[PDB]
Design a binder for these strands. Structure first.
Ligand SMILES: OC[C@H]1O[C@H](O[C@H]2[C@H](O)[C@@H](O)[C@@H](O)O[C@@H]2CO)[C@H](O)[C@@H](O)[C@@H]1O
Ligand SMILES: OC[C@H]1O[C@H](O[C@H]2[C@H](O)[C@@H](O)[C@@H](O)O[C@@H]2CO)[C@H](O)[C@@H](O)[C@@H]1O
Lengths: 405, 422, 417, 407
DNA sequence: TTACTGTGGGAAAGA
DNA sequence: AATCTTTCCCACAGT
DNA sequence: TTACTGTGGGAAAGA
DNA sequence: AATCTTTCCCACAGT
């Protein structure tokens, strides 16, 4: 459709705040803006966009955009130097795929430990001390921890802490063959989560809404969530704190750092109207304020608004957890990686598969060219292969032959 | 009686690698012949014999009393139908032979076919049958609008193409773009496979260039790089040729067997032309009626066609075998599996048979056959590679090789690695 | 029928510790009696009943209809001889009793012996037999390097008694009652005789040197029960009725000796009836000083036999004895699984080593050696305590009828990276 | 022990004839005869003879055994003047200090180094893991890669320590006589590697000091592990040798046990002043230490003046690098029991009599009375220990004094 | 002049 | 219905 | 005075 | 020969 903007954003984000930005754009230019939050839009978008349909603008963390760019569903964004300087260079690095900007970064988001100050004034510095806190709280008819166990994003900080990793960063690229989903570190992390479930400290059936209800109702002492969750805790009568995630085996929990990005559909006929709305309306102090007022964005990409929000202890806590963590790869392999870790976490938590069997299957499911770690009489050995080389570099070196006149 | 390959025999092969390779170079499409007409496959399918195994086999046969005629590899080529007669290729002396008179009739109702190359030694000893890659049958080149939906008929950035020129008035009816002695020329006998790379409209001329992905459309800037020598022609603009005129106002996707024109980027209406065996430039005269059309001779009118390559490598690991070495297996990809009790390696490819075993160096693996495209094997324990003086816990790299029950060794370009971890 | 100890029952015992302890305090040596003479063991062997278990047992027995006489622990003491009669000890009212008239005859040709204490409740219910430590028989005290068994070492327990022939109470004993030193007629204390350097000043904190105690050396007598110490004193030899300043000989068993208070005007440790005071010695020879009978003490090395038990699964038909005593432990890595080797005494095949509330696979070698399979750390990760953390548990011996034999030893599992 | 004559005991692998020259000088200056002896197993002999009140006047051994000798009361207290104490390095005096008392005179700091044949091997291996590959090459040339004393734990300890093995942990300002690192993963990896070299015929379990010394000096083996004392015999054999850093194990440095050759005076000796005179004014001099070093090299001497002149030597520079990577041995009386336990483990593991795990587990509990034991569990490594009845010995007693009335 | 035969271009038939 | 694909037809090129 | 009985001191045998 | 240990004897203490 032409003459109107269709925007897709996740339901856990500030969509009503973004709709206010759409009503401002409609009163200024006369172009109607429709903000939608469909379920599983990360899966929906590549299906609708392939046929040439779907939204004009897509809002998701940078990690899914690399595959969307590879499939040719995204338009190349080409902003001016004056505009590029208004946003942090590392935020632009997250939205860069094959030397091309494929989306507009909006906000840097990381998981933090959200604790109830009345129930727990001093939050645990380690994961290992949580079962002891659970005994104390259970006596008071409460529980220690409750977080989303259906989404690997929330369990990844624990898997990464002792040594787990998605893809290794070698030279100036990600090694799409080097997956650390079945290493000792990943195994120790998932074993600990499974032990919390087996010992009734946590329930395998816990999702986002179940954990959010329990924290906001004051039933659970702690939760693991991002900046977007702060607004609902504010409306509830909870004296909460946002702090560093607890350490595992003396090492910091490494959450996956996401950059909320807005891409433009390649099939969209309103590419200039999308650029106008995103640059001059959304990525402004007033524009970003509207979205943040509904549901907090985190550390915004716009330098001017970030400076005003930096003084917030909750955003200061998000950045500390972001620094200890890692920016997600935007590479196309990320989708396959996430599906493999989701399956492993669920099957290990339910008791369907052992931790070893779940992470071993996840390892070889994550990248197609990935290795496999085996337990031998001499120790742990990584099995790998090479020789089917298929890529073709971005730059080609070839000697020019003369065509005689 | 057939002998199974021994570890000693495997160790010797891995050190020498005296392989016998058979290469089939052909076009991905073929135009149908109607009535009693014969529309020959262009460029002519080529059969190359590579590897030091051929000389080794000749010398072995001649120690058995063979004459040079008896030890000489012979080859015949045809399409996958018995109704058409198989044509002889003359390898004798040369390392290759091109099949200049192959065609597919209207009677042959197949939508896709493979070329069948029947090889044997002059003394009638059978080598085997080697098939090409799939060739799609086309009625005529698409004279109208093309789309990415017909991807089989479209040309993608970074893929190999052959460029030929039809010259009706000239003695040599058809010439082919080829590179000989580090120079581009219009060969009457040989043809080159060129990677057609797409580049951004702002990319300047130079030895180093950034290649963009996607299907090649007319008006776009392309770099033609030789798949053998790595030699590239200067930045060209691929344009649609109509009768004897190159049209500048074309944006349509470039399709199979289309009439081409290659204007040199940032030049005074100069295009890629041919003067006998040599390739030169040509000054285009713009039409006074249409400012979007330019006059170009027959030598400036080229024909684009996507090309493929079939490769088969074998070696008689336990000496001469009674049975032919074919169908020669080809390994496309590998994948490890941790879903089961023990670590498994899944092989994907073609021509797999129950009588094969995967070998990791000189270590024969427990192999499970599923189908001609899928085989599984039990990855050997690292201890299998710690047998002698190599007992120290260290990284181990070994080749992956397919072996037949009669000792025939099928080489692979893939290696396997065991990496100890703390 | 006998009941094996349950984990719940063990958990309750470890929390409460309402044990029944039997203490036998005696001298390490005994002087032989010749002819028809009776030379009584001095100080008198004492039998003490310690622990809150005694009162618990009394209260349980009385809920069963027992009178105070029926619930009253009774004890008899003797030597290991089937010719000498066992003497009754009267514990009724108190928790201790002394055996004031025990002796070893010339007919008893044993070079050593142990005291046998047969205990039971007034209603005839048998508690068991408790032996003392080894007592060496001596002919007479040596007025002498060859024998270390008759010598006194620094840091060892001694008893100090005073023979008073002219007084109504023929013999008084050094004891501490109500945080004060006195010469008791009924009770006697065990005192650690510590040797200190001649330049060590008087004070609550003092550095103790090692070696055998000789005359002229500066000694510190610390009460093994209260921890009360007398001010610095110089142990001197006593000849008839005189304190010898020029004596360097090693102090031996059953020796007459005096205790001069360090840095005083000839003041010695003396007694006036039940109270201990200081006596001024008149010098007579510049190396000898006149000292009365009250200033003349007798030194003798003492020992202590201790037995602790608890009816973990309620009343038992069989006696609680022999009570096993654990001297030492040693781990073993020479085998397939980790083993704990127990060294001590009174070990039986009906015993099992427990690590907290975890019963271990126990192997009986002999009455002095015991082996057990150290439980896996997972045995202590059964509840909410599943997290990898240090675990400390007591070591306890348990009989098949539920009788719990306490130990002062703990076991520790320490996780390492 | 006869008055008017000095009896000295020193190990046979040391410069005893050089020390005898020092004795001849003392005899020509004071008139007191000096007898230098090298009896077999003198570290075991001395505490037996000294207990009865016999033995030598002066005892030469590394500082590690002197702690036990001092505890048994066999050594006389060393009380040198400030001017003399300053002539020797403070850390050398620290090795000879037991319970705030100097129990011996320090002479030289000694550490094991890799001694290689430059003709057979110009570039020595940087790692232990590459030695079997170097052995294949040398075996073809009718030679071998490595040969060292496998009967004495001192030589195998650098490998055992490398990955994580230790004798006693140093907690606060003391050694924890209960914390023993003999059965840890690091120690296990080190002994497994040595046993693997033996099992794969790269080394022979029956190899002792003399066997390995013969093979190196005869040019049969490319490398040896030895101390400074061994350099003199290699010099007479004219082997173009090199003294370098010990190879790394699992990427970590080999940690040799640093020894300080010390001279203690028997407590029973009636010539304590004659012993002090000979040791201070004759042996611990530039001329005195030169005589011993000329016979068999001492290493890095304790005397500052002579050490400065010897520091320029690349072999001593190599010894110090290996010493710096290693640790100065404890002097505590438990050292003797520790050494006997490690000797047994190394021998039994090499011979095949016991597995590495069983040998190192037995050694751990035999190394000290009240030592723990490590176990491999489904949750990880656990240290088993018991808070039993550790001897200790209360030095200070707190007791309220009850007053004796003046009457 | 006509016969000889693959080939691109173009129209007419199908999808 | 368009627009694309398939089938049929024919001029053109040289000894 | 002496009888009554445990106890240290001393002499005379043994080791 | 010493020096230590064992055995036997006896004065001493207050009713
Ligand atoms: O759980 C896998 C999932 O993780 C991340 O998604 C986060 C998202 O980034 C947050 O902004 C928020 O919406 O929660 C999501 C998880 O519920 C990845 O961005 C996503 O691609 C991946 O599927
Ligand atoms: O092998 C055990 C042994 O090692 C050390 O002895 C060394 C000595 O320090 C060196 O100077 C040289 O003589 O070699 C000896 C090994 O044969 C310890 O000093 C020693 O106590 C220990 O038993």
């Amino acid at each position: 459709e032409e003459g109107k903007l269709v925007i897709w954003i996740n339901g856990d984000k500030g969509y009503n705040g973004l709709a206010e930005v759409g009503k401002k754009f409609e009163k200024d230019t006369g172009i109607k803006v429709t903000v939608e939050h469909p379920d599983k839009l990360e899966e929906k978008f590549p299906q609708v966009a392939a046929t040439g349909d779907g939204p004009d603008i897509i809002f998701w963390a940078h990690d899914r955009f690399g595959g969307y760019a590879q499939s040719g569903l995204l338009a190349e964004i080409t902003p001016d130097k004056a505009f590029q300087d208004k946003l942090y260079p590392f935020t632009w690095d997250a939205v860069r795929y094959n030397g091309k900007l494929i989306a507009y970064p909006i906000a840097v988001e990381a998981l933090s430990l959200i604790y109830n100050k009345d129930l727990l004034p001093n939050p645990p510095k380690t994961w290992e001390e949580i079962p002891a806190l659970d005994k104390e709280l259970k006596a008071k008819g409460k529980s220690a921890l409750m977080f989303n166990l259906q989404e690997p994003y929330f369990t990844w900080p624990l898997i990464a802490a002792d040594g787990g990793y998605a893809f290794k960063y070698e030279n100036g690229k990600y090694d799409i063959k080097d997956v650390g989903v079945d290493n000792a570190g990943a195994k120790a992390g998932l074993t600990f989560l499974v032990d919390l479930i087996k010992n009734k400290h946590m329930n395998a059936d816990t999702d986002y809404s179940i954990a959010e209800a329990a924290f906001n109702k004051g039933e659970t002492a702690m939760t693991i969530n991002g900046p977007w969750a702060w607004s609902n805790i504010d409306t509830s009568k909870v004296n909460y704190g946002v702090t560093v995630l607890p350490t595992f085996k003396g090492q910091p929990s490494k959450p996956f750092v996401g950059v909320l990005s807005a891409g433009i559909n390649a099939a969209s006929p309103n590419k200039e109207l999308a650029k106008e709305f995103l640059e001059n309306y959304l990525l402004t102090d007033e524009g970003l304020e509207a979205v943040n007022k509904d549901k907090p964005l985190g550390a915004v990409a716009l330098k001017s608004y970030e400076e005003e929000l930096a003084k917030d202890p909750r955003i200061a806590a998000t950045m500390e957890n972001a620094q200890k963590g890692e920016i997600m790869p935007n590479i196309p392999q990320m989708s396959a990686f996430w599906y493999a870790v989701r399956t492993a976490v669920i099957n290990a938590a339910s008791g369907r598969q052992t931790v070893d069997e779940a992470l071993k299957d996840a390892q070889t499911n994550a990248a197609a060219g990935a290795g496999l770690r085996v337990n031998t009489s001499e120790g742990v050995v990584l099995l790998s292969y090479s020789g089917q080389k298929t890529e073709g570099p971005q730059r080609i070196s070839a000697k020019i032959s003369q065509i005689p006149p | 009686p057939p002998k199974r390959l021994t570890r000693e025999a495997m160790r010797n092969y891995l050190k020498e690698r005296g392989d016998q390779t058979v290469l089939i170079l052909h076009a991905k499409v073929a135009q149908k012949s109607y009535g009693n007409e014969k529309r020959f496959f262009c460029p002519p399918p080529c059969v190359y014999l590579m590897g030091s195994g051929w000389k080794k086999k000749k010398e072995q046969m001649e120690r058995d009393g063979c004459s040079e005629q008896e030890s000489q590899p012979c080859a015949f080529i045809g399409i996958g139908n018995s109704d058409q007669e198989m044509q002889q290729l003359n390898l004798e002396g040369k390392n290759y032979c091109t099949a200049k008179t192959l065609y597919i009739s209207d009677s042959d109702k197949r939508k896709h076919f493979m070329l069948s190359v029947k090889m044997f030694y002059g003394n009638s000893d059978d080598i085997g049958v080697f098939l090409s890659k799939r060739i799609k049958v086309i009625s005529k080149p698409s004279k109208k609008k093309q789309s990415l939906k017909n991807a089989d008929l479209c040309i993608a950035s970074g893929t190999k193409v052959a460029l030929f020129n039809r010259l009706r008035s000239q003695t040599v009816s058809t010439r082919y773009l080829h590179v000989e002695g580090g120079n581009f020329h219009a060969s009457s006998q040989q043809w080159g496979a060129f990677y057609i790379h797409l580049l951004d409209d702002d990319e300047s001329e130079g030895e180093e260039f950034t290649v963009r992905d996607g299907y090649i459309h007319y008006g776009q800037t392309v770099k033609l790089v030789c798949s053998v020598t790595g030699m590239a022609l200067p930045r060209l603009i691929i344009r649609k040729v109509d009768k004897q005129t190159a049209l500048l106002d074309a944006d349509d996707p470039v399709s199979q067997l289309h009439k081409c024109a290659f204007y040199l980027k940032d030049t005074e209406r100069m295009y890629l032309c041919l003067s006998q065996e040599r390739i030169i430039q040509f000054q285009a005269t713009p039409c006074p009626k249409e400012q979007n059309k330019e006059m170009i001779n027959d030598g400036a009118s080229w024909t684009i066609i996507s090309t493929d390559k079939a490769e088969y490598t074998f070696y008689e690991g336990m000496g001469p075998v009674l049975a032919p070495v074919t169908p020669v297996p080809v390994v496309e990809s590998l994948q490890l599996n941790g879903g089961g009790d023990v670590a498994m390696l899944e092989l994907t490819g073609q021509n797999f048979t129950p009588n094969l075993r995967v070998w990791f160096g000189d270590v024969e693996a427990e192999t499970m056959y599923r189908c001609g495209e899928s085989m599984l094997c039990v990855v050997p324990d690292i201890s299998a590679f710690r047998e002698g003086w190599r007992w120290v816990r260290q990284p181990v790299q070994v080749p992956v090789t397919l072996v037949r029950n009669d000792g025939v060794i099928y080489s692979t370009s893939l290696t396997f690695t065991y990496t100890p971890e703390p």
